[PDB]
A and B are shown apart, each in its own frame.
Chain A
Amino acid sequence: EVQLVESGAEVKKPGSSVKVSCKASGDTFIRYSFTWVRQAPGQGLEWMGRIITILDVAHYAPHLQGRVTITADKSTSTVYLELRNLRSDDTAVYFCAGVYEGEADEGEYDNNGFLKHWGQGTLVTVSSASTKGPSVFPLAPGGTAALGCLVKDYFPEPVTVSWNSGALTSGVHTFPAVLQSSGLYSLSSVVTVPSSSLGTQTYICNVNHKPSNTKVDKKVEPK
């Protein structure tokens, strides 16, 4: 078995290049072939290419040919994906994947095209937008009441939201972010609570945005 660990999220301007990596450990590196697969937000899986590690030979999807390069460093058991001349539509999670091919070093090679082992994925955001933290606005409050926070105008993804420092989880809905026409993201987090609890129990949404190094705590009151 091999474990695949990928490099951290990237944020790029259109026109830039990106190089993402994938460290394979646990088995014999040259007995595996490695494949890169991407997934744009909301979309399906797209095969980018595959490297026959023992031969140092890579093959690419036609729509990518020319601006994608897959390499492998045998000395550090690391696979690399380089994508050039980035476009906004290159925004996606990039997965490294691999499969055992047989005793390749003894000339056995099945040339398997399916993918058994997968990395955790790398988010690559390609946008003209500049990094910025969210503005957090209250969604102020029948037997149950709804309340929440609006987390607006940040870039890039992701943002995380908790309530009462993780003390409140029941009935919480934190929505997937939407991309605004400004190129900035926006999401709401909501929670439904007993209506008799307003005025006594205080509700605070905690918002964290690592990319901008921002942390906001917003109290949401009846009025």
Chain B
Amino acid sequence: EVVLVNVTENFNMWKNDMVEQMHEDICSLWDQSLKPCVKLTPLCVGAGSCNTSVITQACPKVSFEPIPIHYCAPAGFAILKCNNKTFNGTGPCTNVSTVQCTHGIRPVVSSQLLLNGSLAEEEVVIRSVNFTDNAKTIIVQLNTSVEINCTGAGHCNIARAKWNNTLKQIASKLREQFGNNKTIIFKQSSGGDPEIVTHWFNCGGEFFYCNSTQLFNSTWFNGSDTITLPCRIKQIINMWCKVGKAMYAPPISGQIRCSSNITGLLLTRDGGNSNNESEIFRPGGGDMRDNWRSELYKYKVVKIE
């Protein structure tokens, strides 16, 4: 909207109230939009014997279809946008402007792979609040999209050549960060909830759990046409907004089909005092705030008058 001449501004994408607002907004859209047949949430207020809260309600089958949302300044505030093409997300931004609203952000809820988002303008970008801390998520932003085509018949397809090319570019970025003498290894999820261990997303209103092992099984700096991931549509789901469980009715459509563009990844690295010269990276995700961060990293909200 208007580029602030000769202004330097500090950003911190890891402490951004815009992310918190978007998180609460998306959580609300889901409550009012998706209705489970049964939902369970815990209640163990240190009283001893727990009391699970159980809600049972009409369970209509509805195709969910994420619509771009724009965030404009809240009353009394302004939105500053960083213009540095390859901004890491945390630090001084020299080329900053004021905008009326953010760009249109599709609120896609998923684990492991970020879908239908924004691409990096120059090279692949990796971001973390602390690269030294193995417990912190690493957000990967691709500069080229990879198609992933999924069907309710139980699989997803990805071009092996394209995926190979993107892995190479991600690994190059990772050793640029952790050591240019490092073998970069990709492995499957270590474990946890099903929504965490598989690439989890929604398509045609249904929850897909696709095994991503074939995507994360390679070593860098050390049949073959399409990668076909085995998929499962599930009815009993762990809630992402709060701790709890939701149950949905089985599918009613015989033709569930989605094609998405992979535009980023959520990764975690294996820590450890292993003085080996290799870093192990596994697909991660689960905190949807990281999904929103991947789009909001270039914005901050500042008090005006």
**Direct A–B contact in complex, judged by CB atoms less than 8 Å apart:** yes
A residues at B contact (CB < 8 Å): 52, 54-57, 59, 104, 106-111
On whether the beta carbons of A57 and B40 are closer than 8 Å, the reply is yes
Q: B60 near A: Cβ within 8 Å? A: no
Q: How far is the CB of A187 from chain B (nearest CB, A)?
A: 45
Q: B278 near A: Cβ within 8 Å? A: no
Q: How far is the CB of A141 from chain B (nearest CB, A)?
A: 64
On whether the beta carbons of B249 and A111 are closer than 8 Å, the reply is yes
Q: B149 near A: Cβ within 8 Å? A: no
Q: B173 near A: Cβ within 8 Å? A: no
What are the interface flags for B238-264 relative to A under an 8 Å C-beta threshold, 1 for contact and 0 otherwise? 000000010101100000000000000
What are the interface flags for B151-184 relative to A under an 8 Å C-beta threshold, 1 for contact and 0 otherwise? 0000000000000000000000000000000000
Given A110-B250, A111-B37, A104–B236 Cβ distance below 8 Å? Answer: yes
Q: How far is the CB of A138 from chain B (nearest CB, A)?
A: 60
Expressed in whole angstroms, the Cα–Cα distance for A108 and B54 within the complex equals 20
Q: Contact partner of A107 among B40, B54, B236, CB < 8 A?
A: B236
- CB-CB < 8 A to B38: which residues of A? 52, 55, 57
On whether the beta carbons of B245 and A108 are closer than 8 Å, the reply is no
Chain A residue with the shortest CB-CB distance to B40: A55
Expressed in whole angstroms, the Cα–Cα distance for A109 and B56 within the complex equals 16
- CB-CB < 8 A to B40: which residues of A? 55, 57
Q: B237 near A: Cβ within 8 Å? A: yes
On whether the beta carbons of B236 and A109 are closer than 8 Å, the reply is yes
On whether the beta carbons of B194 and A107 are closer than 8 Å, the reply is yes
Given A52-B38, A55-B38, A55-B40, A109–B235 Cβ distance below 8 Å? Answer: yes
Q: How far is the CB of A181 from chain B (nearest CB, A)?
A: 44
10 other A-B residue contacts (CB within 8 Å) besides A56-B52, A108-B232: A54-B236, A55-B236, A104-B236, A108-B234, A108-B236, A109-B235, A109-B236, A110-B235, A110-B250, A111-B250
Q: Which of B7-51 contact A (CB under 8 A)?
A: 37-38, 40
Q: Which of B51-94 contact A (CB under 8 A)?
A: 52, 54, 56
Expressed in whole angstroms, the Cα–Cα distance for A104 and B237 within the complex equals 11
On whether the beta carbons of A108 and B247 are closer than 8 Å, the reply is no
Expressed in whole angstroms, the Cα–Cα distance for A56 and B52 within the complex equals 10
Q: How far is the CB of A124 from chain B (nearest CB, A)?
A: 28
Expressed in whole angstroms, the Cα–Cα distance for A104 and B194 within the complex equals 13
- CB-CB < 8 A to B247: which residues of A? 52, 55, 109, 111
A-B CB contact pairs (8 Å), 19 listed: A52-B38, A52-B247, A54-B236, A55-B40, A55-B236, A56-B52, A57-B38, A57-B54, A59-B56, A104-B236, A106-B194, A106-B234, A107-B209, A107-B234, A108-B232, A108-B234, A111-B235, A111-B247, A111-B250
- CB-CB < 8 A to B56: which residues of A? 57, 59
Chain B residue with the shortest CB-CB distance to A59: B56
Q: How far is the CB of A162 from chain B (nearest CB, A)?
A: 51
- CB-CB < 8 A to A108: which residues of B? 232, 234-236
Chain B residue with the shortest CB-CB distance to A109: B235
Q: How far is the CB of A54 from chain B (nearest CB, A)?
A: 7
Q: How far is the CB of B137 from chain A (nearest CB, A)?
A: 24
- CB-CB < 8 A to B245: which residues of A? 55
Q: How far is the CB of B247 from chain A (nearest CB, A)?
A: 6
Expressed in whole angstroms, the Cα–Cα distance for A96 and B209 within the complex equals 34
- CB-CB < 8 A to A109: which residues of B? 235-236, 247, 250
Closest 4 CB pairs of A and B: A107-B234, A107-B236, A109-B235, A109-B236
Q: How far is the CB of B36 from chain A (nearest CB, A)?
A: 11
- CB-CB < 8 A to A107: which residues of B? 194, 209, 232, 234-237
- CB-CB < 8 A to B237: which residues of A? 107
Expressed in whole angstroms, the Cα–Cα distance for A110 and B236 within the complex equals 10
Expressed in whole angstroms, the Cα–Cα distance for A110 and B245 within the complex equals 16
Among A55, A57, A107, A110, residue most surrounded by chain B Cβ atoms (within 10 Å) = A107
What are the interface flags for B250-282 relative to A under an 8 Å C-beta threshold, 1 for contact and 0 otherwise? 100000000000000000000000000000000
